[PDB]
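If I may wish for something, please sit down with the protein I am sending here and say whether tokens and residues agree:
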Amino acid sequence: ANPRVFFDMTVGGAPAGRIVMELYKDAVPRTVENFRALCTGEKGVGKSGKPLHYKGSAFHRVIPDFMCQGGDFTRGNGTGGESIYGEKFADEKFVHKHTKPGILSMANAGPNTNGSQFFICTVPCNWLDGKHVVFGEVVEGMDVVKNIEKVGSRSGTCSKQVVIADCGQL
């Protein structure tokens, strides 16, 4: 089966709902296994000294009509993150594309620099194809994603704190 994982989100401390994501284990198992394990926290503490876990981390970069980015649980600002493999890992495959709202894809700092940061597209983003590894999609809770999008800005800075208050695997 393709794993299903969830984030229970807060915005400004108030519950904003649950996002459920299907992960394409069939197509990109290594990338999926990293994300899945970071949802459960099962690997424990990373080399960075932080739990390898999305719980309590924030969406630090949100741009309306584009995407919501999170996953930096070591620095909280886009400079951090750690994978279950080490600091970074290679681009697995580009078989999936950024075809619709809710696509889940890896943020990076160029080729072969995947860590723990990810983004959820709110629009089709074909200009990202071949540059970011797509590894799943939001299957429930696009309203929650739109909730988050509305506290974003053109620069990505959020006007309220957006937190993964709980997460895990279904």
